Amino acid sequence: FRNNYDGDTVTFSPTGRLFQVEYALEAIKQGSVTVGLRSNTHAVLVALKRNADELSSYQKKIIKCDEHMGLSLAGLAPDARVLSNYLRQQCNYSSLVFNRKLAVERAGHLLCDKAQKNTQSYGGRPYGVGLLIIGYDKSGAHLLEFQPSGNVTELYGTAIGARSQGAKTYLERTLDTFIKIDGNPDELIKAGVEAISQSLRDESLTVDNLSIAIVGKDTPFTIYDGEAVAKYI
Amino acid sequence: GYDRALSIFSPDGHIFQVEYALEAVKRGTCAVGVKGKNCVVLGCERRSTLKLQDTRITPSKVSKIDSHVVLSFSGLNADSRILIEKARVEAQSHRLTLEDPVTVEYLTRYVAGVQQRYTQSGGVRPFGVSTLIAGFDPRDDEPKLYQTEPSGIYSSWSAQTIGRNSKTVREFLEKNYDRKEPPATVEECVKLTVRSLLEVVQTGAKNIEITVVKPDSDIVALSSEEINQYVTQIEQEKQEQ
Amino acid sequence: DRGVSTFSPEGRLFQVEYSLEAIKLGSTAIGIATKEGVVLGVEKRATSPLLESDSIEKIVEIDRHIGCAMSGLTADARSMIEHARTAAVTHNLYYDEDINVESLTQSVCDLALRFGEGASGEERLMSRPFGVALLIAGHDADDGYQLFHAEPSGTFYRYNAKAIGSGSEGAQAELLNEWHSSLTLKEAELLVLKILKQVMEEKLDENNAQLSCITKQDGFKIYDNEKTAELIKELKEKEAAE
Amino acid sequence: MTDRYSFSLTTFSPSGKLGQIDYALTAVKQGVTSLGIKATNGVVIATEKKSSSPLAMSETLSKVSLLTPDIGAVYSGMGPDYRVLVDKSRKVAHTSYKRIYGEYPPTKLLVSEVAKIMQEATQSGGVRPFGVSLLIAGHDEFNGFSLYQVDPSGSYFPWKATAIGKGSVAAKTFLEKRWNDELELEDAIHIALLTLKESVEGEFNGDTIELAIIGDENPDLLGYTGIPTDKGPRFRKLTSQEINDRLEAL
Amino acid sequence: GTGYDLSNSVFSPDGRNFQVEYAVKAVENGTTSIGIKCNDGVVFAVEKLITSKLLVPQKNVKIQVVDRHIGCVYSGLIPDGRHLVNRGREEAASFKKLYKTPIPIPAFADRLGQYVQAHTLYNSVRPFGVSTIFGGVDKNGAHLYMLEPSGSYWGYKGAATGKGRQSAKAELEKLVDHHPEGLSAREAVKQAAKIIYLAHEDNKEKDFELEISWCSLSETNGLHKFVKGDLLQEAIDFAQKEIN
Amino acid sequence: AGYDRHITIFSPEGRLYQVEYAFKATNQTNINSLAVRGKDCTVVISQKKVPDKLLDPTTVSYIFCISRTIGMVVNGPIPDARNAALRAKAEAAEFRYKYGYDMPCDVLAKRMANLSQIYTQRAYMRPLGVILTFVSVDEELGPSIYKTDPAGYYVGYKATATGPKQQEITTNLENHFKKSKIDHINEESWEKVVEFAITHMIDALGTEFSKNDLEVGVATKDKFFTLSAENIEERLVAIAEQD
Amino acid sequence: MDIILGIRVQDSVILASSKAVTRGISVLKDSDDKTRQLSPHTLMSFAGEAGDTVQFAEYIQANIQLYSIREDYELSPQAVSSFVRQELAKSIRSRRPYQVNVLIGGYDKKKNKPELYQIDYLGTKVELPYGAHGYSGFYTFSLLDHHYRPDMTTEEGLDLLKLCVQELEKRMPMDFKGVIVKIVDKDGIRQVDDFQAQ
Amino acid sequence: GSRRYDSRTTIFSPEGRLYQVEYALESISHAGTAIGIMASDGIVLAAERKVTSTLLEQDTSTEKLYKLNDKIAVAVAGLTADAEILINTARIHAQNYLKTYNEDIPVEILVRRLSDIKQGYTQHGGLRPFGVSFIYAGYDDRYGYQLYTSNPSGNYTGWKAISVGANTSAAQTLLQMDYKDDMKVDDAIELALKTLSKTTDSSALTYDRLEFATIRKGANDGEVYQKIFKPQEIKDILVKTGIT
Amino acid sequence: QFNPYGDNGGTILGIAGEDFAVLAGDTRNITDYSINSRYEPKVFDCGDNIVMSANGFAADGDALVKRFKNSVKWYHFDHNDKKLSINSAARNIQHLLYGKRFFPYYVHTII
C-alpha cells in the first residue's frame, strides 16, 4: 500500500494523503520541544536546545527575522535557516519598498505559499521543519505555527516537538491566565517555562540548555541564552 | 535536459556506479610506472584478443599532456580520450595564464578533479579509467609519478600499476623496489618495469611497450628491439639458476 | 527508482543518511580544542607500502587562522575546501577583516543540501550529497579557539573535542573522559596521538599519522614528520611509565 | 510541466533489438496495403481508401500526397503519423533546398530528409518512432524517375516496384511476376490496379481506390503561362472517373 | 494490468484518472463550505473547526477575495486552495490591465478552470486537492461556481463541498424548491448559517466557527465583503434556533 | 516493460493503449450527438443531461462557438472539452490575423488533429479524452462536418454521430441516405433540418425529448448559433404535429 | 606604427622587428621582442593595438602548440597561417576586433622551403618574397623591389635587411630603437644577436 | 515523475560493462558483413547487402559504402539511418578542417572526431548509442594508406585487414589465415571476396548482394583515387576472381 | 535626451577627534536656483556608531545610505550581531560604490 504512494510529493494515495509530506511532518516530532505563547502586550518563545555529546554545543532553536519578528524551529535545522532567511528578506522588502513592517499574519501567508510550492512539483521536497513565529505589529502580538504541509495557524500559544503534547495541554489549560499577562514580560516568560517543562522527561532545563525569546509593544525581538535565562530556571 | 542522478549513495554508503567504474579498470590492460633516481618509466601491455592490427596508427597507451608530462591509463579507451584532451587543453591554458608549464602534481590534481566532478553531476556516468601521470616539474630533476581513479582520488607512488593482474605486479614491485636505493639508472629502471610486466604479460615482446621520461622534456618510447633485448637479458637471469 | 531528495517514513533523507555511512568507513580524524589552540589529527592509511605517504593530504588550510580535517570520500572535499578558502578570502576583501570561524563553517554547510534532480527552491545542481565530513578548527577574536563538525546533513556542531571516522564511537568515548577545560596544547597533542594509536589498525608512526594545529600567534601549521615523531616517542614513554 | 523526458524511449534490448522500431513496423504491417511501380517513363503509387464509416467522405482525406510538384508519397501504418510527416516533408523541401538553390530537391534527397526526421524520432528524448512506412516516388532532371521506401527505423531503399502493409507479401510476389524493365506507365497503372484488387475485400472502384502518378509535365496544371522553362508538375493524382475507366480494361 | 494510479496523467483502462480521483478524496475529507446564489448576488459560508481553545477566534480566515468583486471558498488542502486563488488574482489582474473592465465571473471561472485542468495533463504535477466555490456580481448579474480537482466546473444555484456536503446539498435543494422566485441576499446569509450548522453534524465531535461573506448588488454594491458583527450574530442565532 | 500502457509508446501489437483508454473516456458523459448537412446549413444535436437540481442548466453545454462561422460540439469530459475549445478559438483568431481570412472548418480540424497526433507521439503530453465535431458553412466548401479524435485522426462526413449509442444513430442515418441517394438533407430552412436531426435522433435512440433534453447548434452562411429552450420547444412541437 | 619586416631568401625567412615601446610622450622600453614562436619551425611577428597585440599572439600560440601535442606533428607554415587568417577574419566582424597585423615566417619541413605570410587585422592574407606592416612598407618595398633575388643566401638576406633598416632610420620620423632579427630555416628559429652593428 | 520510464542508457553493469554499448554491438552482429583489407598500393572495402529483392533498384542503392571525403570512405554495419546521421557530420568535419587549414583532413583525425561523438552518447545524455560500426578506409600524406574501425563504444583502432557485422569471427580467422604484408590491391580484392564468399549466410555470393570500393593511387597520375564499383563492375571482378 | 543625474547641492564636513568624531551638513536641498527644502537631513546614524552622508545627487545619495544600512542589518544577521568596525564599513561601502563603477552613484560620501 503506502509503499507505492510515497516515492515523491507529486503522488496522492488512494485515500487523498501525501505521504512524502507526512514523512516530513514526522521529522518535526523527532525534534526537540519548543513552546510559544502570547498575551496582548508580548509574545514569547521557549525552546529546549538539544546537544550531541557533552563535548558539543547545544544547537540554536530560535532565529530573529526582524526587530519585530522571530521564530523557533523543530526539525531540520538547514530548512529553518532557509525559511527564516527567506522570511528575513520579506520583512526587509516590506521596509525598503513600503517603509512598512511586515505584519505577522502576512509573513505567515508567505511561508504557507512558499511551502506549498514544494508539494506539487516533481523533484521538489517538502521542508522538514516546524516553526513557531511570534511578532508584534500594527494589530498587536501574534503567534503562528508553521507546518511543512503549508498549514500556518494563529494561536494564543502552542508547542511542537517530542512530548510537545504535554506543554500544549498545559497551555490549553492555563489559557485564560497567560493571555492576560500584559505589561509584564517576566510573568509571560515564566508561564512559558512552565508550559515547556511539561514536556520534559529525559532531564531538567538547565542554563546552557534553555532558550527564550521575546517580542512586544516596546520590546524588540530579543533572544536569551545561558546566564541570561538563569533567572527563570 | 537529462540530469538523472546516476551516481548516488546506497544503504551501505557506497556509490556503485563509481565502484563499477573501477571494475571497468580492472578489466583494462595493465599499466605500470616506476620512478628511478633521475627518470620515470611507464609500461603498458597490449591485449591479444585479436592480432592483425596496424601498430603504426593504432593509438598508443602512453600520452603526452605536455612536453614534460605523460599519462598512461587502464580502463575504457573512449573515456581516456576525453580525459587526455581536457588535460592537454589545461596544460596550455596554465602556460598561457601562469607563464609556466604545469607541475606533474597540478596536472594530476586537475584530472582527478574532472573525474570527481563526474561522480556527482547529473546525467553523467563516471570515467571507467584510472591514470598514471609522470614527468618532471619545470626546471626540476626529482621524478614525479601519480595515480588517479574514478572516485576522483589521487596520490603519488614510488612505483605503481593499474589494470588486470595489477595485483600480481604490484606484489612483484612491493618486493623488488627499494625506496632506499631506487633504480639509479635509466636502464636498470626500465628493466625493473619490463620484469614487473613479464609477471603478467606471459611472453609478449610485441605486447609490451615502454616509454622513458627524463628531466627537461626528454620523452621517448622504446622500440620492439630495445624492449625485446630487455626481455632477453631477463629470461637468462632465471635460467642462470 | 526513488528521488534523491526523498523522505524516509521516519522523517529522514535517505541520501543524507547513506552519506553518513560512507563516512563511518572513512579514515579516523580527531580534533581537540584547548585555551592554547586546537589540534587536528588524522590517519593517513596508505593502501600499500609503495604509496608515498606524504602525498596524503587530509588536513588542509582554509586561511591563516582556519584549518580543517576530513573523513570519508575525500575527493568530495576538494570543492568544499575551495569554497571555504574563497569565502574566507572574499570576506576579507569585502570587509577588511578575517572571517569568523563559525561563519566559515556555516558557509560550507550551505553547499551540503544543494542537491537533487529538480528541487524547487533555487538551482541546486549536484546529483548527490557530499560523502565526507569535516572538522573545521580555527580562531578569531570573537569566540577564541573553535572546533566545528560539519556533516553532509547541512548541520554543524561545535565540540571541545570530536573524532570522526572509522574509530570514532570508541575514540569519542575516550575523549568524553580525557577532555577537560584546562588541557594544554601539548597535552591535547599526545591525547590525539594516543586515541589515534588505539583505533588505528596500523602501528601509529610519523608516517601514517599526521598532526597539526591552529594558534592565535602562528596560525594554522602542519607538524612536519620529525616534530610528530618526537611527540610519538614522548607518548610511548609516558605510557610505559605506568 | 516541462517535458522531463530527456531520455530515449527506444533502447537496445539484450538481444540487440530496438523494441519500439520493431513494434512500429508491426503497426505498419497492420495498415492497409499500398504499392509502388516504376515504369520506364513514370512511376505509380496507389493504396485503398478504407472508408472508416459510410457517413465519412473519403475524398476529404488523401493517403496519396504531393510533396513537391514532381514528388508524391503514400503510406501504410498510422494515418495521423503520416499526415504530420507530409507537412514536415513539404516544409523541409523548402527550408533545406528550394530556399537555397531555388529549385525543388531531387527525390533521393527529399527522401533522405524525411528519413532523417524519422531516424530522430528513434533516438531523441521522450518520443516514439513513427508508425508508418512511406513509398515516395518522383522525378528529377539528373536522376530520372525513382521509387523509395522509408521505414520507421529511418531506413530507406530504392525499388523497381514494391508494396507495404497488410497483403504486402502477396502483392510483392505478384509484382515480381509482372514487372520488367520495359513497362510503359500505362502498363504499371494496369499492373497496379490488378495487384491492388487482390488485397481488396469489398468494393473496388475509383471511390475506394486512390492512385497518383509521376509522369510527364502537366503545363495545363501550371496555372500560368509565359515562362518557357516552367512546364508544369509531373505529379498527378487520378480522378475517380479516370480510375473506373481503366478498371473496365482490367 | 495495474498501476494506472501511480502517475498523474495516466488513463486507466476504463478511461479514468485515479490521481484526480484520489485528490477528490482529500477534498471530501475536508471541512464543509457552501455558496448560495441569491437574486442579486452570492453568499459564501464555511465551517471552521476549532481544533483547540488555542486558536485565536475570528483569526484564521478562510474565505478569500479575488480583485474586489469575486469571492472564493474551498474545501480540502487549504495550501492548494490559496495557491489557486493566487493564480486567480494574477489571472484577474492580467485581464483588467488589458481590457480595463474587472474580470467577468464566467471568464474568471474558465480562467481557474483551464489552470486546474492543466494539472491533470502531466505526471510532473499533482492535481489540486480542493474543490472551490466562488463567484460574484458582474455586468450581467450574479454567478455561483464550483470547481473540482478534475478541472470541471458549472454554474450553480447552490453549491456545497466537503465533509457535510450531502446534508448541505440536501438543504440547498430544499431552498431551491421553496423559493422559485428567488432568495434575497439578506435571507441567503441566514439560510447559509443554518445550512452550515446542519452540515456540521457529520463532524459534531469538534466545535466550530462560522464564517460568511457576500457579494450583493444592493447590499454591498457588487463588492465582495465579509458579513460581520450584528448581521453575523443575527444569522448565527437564526441557525442556532432552527437546530433545535 | 509493462509501462507501454502508461505512456504513448508502442505495444508489441503495435498499439497505443493510452490512446485507446483516451477514447474510452469520451463516453464518460453518456451523451450522444449527431450532425447533419442541410441544403445550405449544418445542424448539430446533442443530448443535454442536467440531473442535479442545484445546477444552473444554462451554464451546462458541450457545444462551443469557435468563431462567427465555426461551431464545435465535444463528446467527452468537460475540462478536456474546454481545454480543446479554448485552443481552437485561439487557433482560429490567429489564423485570421496571419492570413487575412476566416479559418475554414476543415483546416481548423486538421490543425487540431495534428495537435492531437503530437500527444500521441510525445511521452509527457496525455491525449485529450474528447472527440471534436466541427461544423460550418465554409465559404469555399459549403456545409461542413469534420470530426477529430484522441488518435489524431479526422475526416469529413455527410453526417455523423458520437457517443455511447453512436452505432444506432449512424446506421439510422446511413439508411436514410441509402434511401434518399443524396449526401444531404434536401431542405432550404435550417429549422426543418434541425427537426430532421432531432427526429432521427429519436427514432434511432427510441426516446422522446423535452426542450431541456437537447442542445442544438446551427451553422449558416456567415454565422453559427445555438438554439434556446424555446427555439427547441417550438421545433419539438413541429415534429409533434407530423406524428 | 612599429616596424615589422619579413624577407624570404633561398633557404630561410628573416624577420626584423622594432624594439621600441613608446607610450605617448615616453619611450618605455627599447628591448621589446614583438615575436612569438608558434612551433619549432614557425615564427610570428606582430604589431598593432596595445592589448590586442600579445593577447592575440599568445592565443594563437596556445592553439598551435595544442595541435602539436594532440597530433604529435607540426602543422605546415601554410596551415598555421590559414588558421591565423581564419581567426582574424572572425575577429573583424566580432564585438571588439583584434587590431593586430602579423608576419608569419616558417620552414616547411615537408616541402623543404621557407615561407613568408603577411596578414592584417582584416584577415587579409598574402604570401610574399618580402613584406612589412605599417609604414615601413613605404620605404622598404622599393629597396627590395630593387635588390631582391630568390636565390639569395641567408647572409645576403641579412645584408639586404641591413640596407632596409638604414633607410628606415634615415627617413622615418620615429626612433624605433633598432630591430631584433630572427631566422627561420630547416634547423629551426634563431636570433641574430649581433645586428646592432653587423 | 518521469524517472519511472528512464532506461538509464548510460550506466555501468556490476561488471563494469556498458549495457547499451554491449546490446548495440549485439545488434550489429546481425548486419551484413563488411570487410576492409589494406595492401601496399591501396585499400579494399567489400560489404554484403543485407536483404535484397528482384525489384530492389540496385544501381541507385547504397547501404554500406559511403564516401566521406575524396581520400576517405567508410563501410557500415548496423542501423543505416544511424550511420547516415554520423556520416553527414563526418563529411562536414572534413570540410571545416579544410576551411581552417587549407589542407585535407588527416584520416585519423576524422576518425577520432567521429568516435568521440559516439563516446559521448555513452557517458551522458540519457539517449541510446548509435547502432553502427565503421571501417574507415582512407589515405593522407602522413600515414599513407590507413584502415580504421570504430563502434558504438566510441573506441577505434587500426588494422591491416578487418571485418564488421555478422560472422566476423569466421572472417577474421580466414583473413588472419591468408593475409600477407606484401599483398597487392588485386590480391586484397580477391581475399576480400573469398572471405565474404565463405561467410555469406546466403546461397551464393552474387554481385547484386555486394558493394565494393577501392582506394588506389593510379600510377599514371600520382594522385590517390576512390572507386566505388557499380553493379556491373562488381559482376565483372566477381567472374574474374573465379566466383562467376 | 534623458539625463539620469541631477544636483541637489549641499555640503558636508567630517572631523575626527581623539575620542570622538563629527559629521556635519547643511540642511538645504536645492535644484538649480530654487530651494526644494530648508530642512532635509543629509547625515544619518546607521547604527554600530557609524554616521554616514552621501552628498551630491539626492536620489543616488539616499539609495546608497539605504543600501549600506541594509548591509549593516545583514552583517548582524550573518555574524551574530557583531558590531561593524568603521574600517569594515569603509571597505564595504567601497564595494557598494565600485559596483556601479559604470553608472555611478553621483555622490561624494563621508562616514
Swiss-Prot record, chain A:
Subcellular location: Cytoplasm; Nucleus
Cleaved signal peptide residues: none
InterPro entries reported for this sequence: Ntn_hydrolases_N (IPR029055), Proteasome_alpha (IPR050115), Proteasome_alpha-type (IPR023332), Proteasome_asu_N (IPR000426), Proteasome_sua/b (IPR001353)
Cross-referenced SUPFAM superfamilies: N-terminal nucleophile aminohydrolases (Ntn hydrolases)
Alphabetized UniProt keyword annotations: Cytoplasm, Isopeptide bond, Nucleus, Phosphoprotein, Proteasome, Ubl conjugation
UniProt crosslink position (Glycyl lysine isopeptide (Lys-Gly) (interchain with G-Cter in ubiquitin)): 190
In-chain residues carrying the UniProt-annotated modification Phosphoserine: 13
Keyword Transcription regulation in annotation: no
Gene Ontology CC, one term: proteasome core complex, alpha-subunit complex
One annotated GO biological process: proteasomal ubiquitin-independent protein catabolic process
Family: Belongs to the peptidase T1A family.
Subunit comment: The 26S proteasome consists of a 20S proteasome core and two 19S regulatory subunits. The 20S proteasome core is composed of 28 subunits that are arranged in four stacked rings, resulting in a barrel-shaped structure. The two end rings are each formed by seven alpha subunits, and the two central rings are each formed by seven beta subunits. The catalytic chamber with the active sites is on the inside of the barrel.
Other known facts: Present with 7210 molecules/cell in log phase SD medium.
Protein's recorded name: Proteasome subunit alpha type-6
Source lineage: Eukaryota, Fungi, Dikarya, Ascomycota, Saccharomycotina
Curated annotation (Swiss-Prot), chain E:
Modified how: The alpha and beta forms are probably products of the same gene with different post-translational modifications.
Superkingdom of this protein's organism: Eukaryota
GO-annotated cellular components: nucleus; proteasome complex; proteasome core complex, alpha-subunit complex; proteasome storage granule
Stretches assigned to coiled coil: none
Keywords recorded for this protein, A-Z: Acetylation, Cytoplasm, Nucleus, Proteasome
Main localization, broad class: cytoplasm
Subcellular locations according to the entry: Cytoplasm; Nucleus
GO biological process, one term: proteasome-mediated ubiquitin-dependent protein catabolic process
One of the record's GO molecular function terms: mRNA binding
Further information: Present with 12000 molecules/cell in log phase SD medium.
Function: The proteasome degrades poly-ubiquitinated proteins in the cytoplasm and in the nucleus. It is essential for the regulated turnover of proteins and for the removal of misfolded proteins. The proteasome is a multicatalytic proteinase complex that is characterized by its ability to cleave peptides with Arg, Phe, Tyr, Leu, and Glu adjacent to the leaving group at neutral or slightly basic pH. It has an ATP-dependent proteolytic activity.
Family: Belongs to the peptidase T1A family.
Name of this protein: Probable proteasome subunit alpha type-7
Organism: Saccharomyces cerevisiae (strain ATCC 204508 / S288c)
Curated annotation (Swiss-Prot), chain F:
Cross-referenced Pfam families: Proteasome, Proteasome_A_N
Subcellular location(s) per record: Cytoplasm; Nucleus
Cross-link (Glycyl lysine isopeptide (Lys-Gly) (interchain with G-Cter in ubiquitin)): 223
Broad class of where this protein is predominantly found: cytoplasm
Keywords: Acetylation, Cytoplasm, Isopeptide bond, Nucleus, Phosphoprotein, Proteasome, Ubl conjugation
Database matches in InterPro entries: Ntn_hydrolases_N, Proteasome_alpha, Proteasome_alpha-type, Proteasome_asu_N, Proteasome_sua/b, Proteasome_subunit_alpha6
Domain of life: Eukaryota
GO-annotated biological processes: proteasomal ubiquitin-independent protein catabolic process; proteasome-mediated ubiquitin-dependent protein catabolic process
Phosphoserine modifications at: 228
A GO term from the CC aspect: proteasome complex
Classification via Gene3D superfamilies: Glutamine Phosphoribosylpyrophosphate, subunit 1, domain 1 (3.60.20.10)
The protein's assembly and partners: The 26S proteasome consists of a 20S proteasome core and two 19S regulatory subunits. The 20S proteasome core is composed of 28 subunits that are arranged in four stacked rings, resulting in a barrel-shaped structure. The two end rings are each formed by seven alpha subunits, and the two central rings are each formed by seven beta subunits. The catalytic chamber with the active sites is on the inside of the barrel. Interacts with CIC1.
Note: Present with 15200 molecules/cell in log phase SD medium.
Family: Belongs to the peptidase T1A family.
Name of the protein: Proteasome subunit alpha type-1
Origin species: Saccharomyces cerevisiae (strain ATCC 204508 / S288c) (Baker's yeast)
Organism placement in taxonomy: Eukaryota, Fungi, Dikarya, Ascomycota, Saccharomycotina
Swiss-Prot record, chain H:
Keywords: Cytoplasm, Isopeptide bond, Nucleus, Proteasome, Ubl conjugation
Gene: PRE9
Cross-link (Glycyl lysine isopeptide (Lys-Gly) (interchain with G-Cter in ubiquitin)): 99, 198, 230
Extra information: Present with 17100 molecules/cell in log phase SD medium.
Location (main, coarse): cytoplasm
Pfam family name, one: Proteasome_A_N
Record-given protein name: Proteasome subunit alpha type-3
Cross-referenced InterPro entries: Ntn_hydrolases_N, Proteasome_alpha, Proteasome_alpha-type, Proteasome_asu_N, Proteasome_bsu_CS, Proteasome_sua/b
Annotated Gene3D superfamilies: Glutamine Phosphoribosylpyrophosphate, subunit 1, domain 1
Record's GO cellular component terms: cytosol; nucleus; proteasome complex; proteasome core complex, alpha-subunit complex; proteasome storage granule
Similarity comment text for this entry: Belongs to the peptidase T1A family.
Subunit structure: The 26S proteasome consists of a 20S proteasome core and two 19S regulatory subunits. The 20S proteasome core is composed of 28 subunits that are arranged in four stacked rings, resulting in a barrel-shaped structure. The two end rings are each formed by seven alpha subunits, and the two central rings are each formed by seven beta subunits. The catalytic chamber with the active sites is on the inside of the barrel.
Location within or outside the cell: Cytoplasm; Nucleus
Organism ancestry: Eukaryota, Fungi, Dikarya, Ascomycota, Saccharomycotina
Keyword flag tRNA processing: no
Organism of provenance: Saccharomyces cerevisiae (strain ATCC 204508 / S288c) (Baker's yeast)
One biological process term in Gene Ontology: proteasome core complex assembly
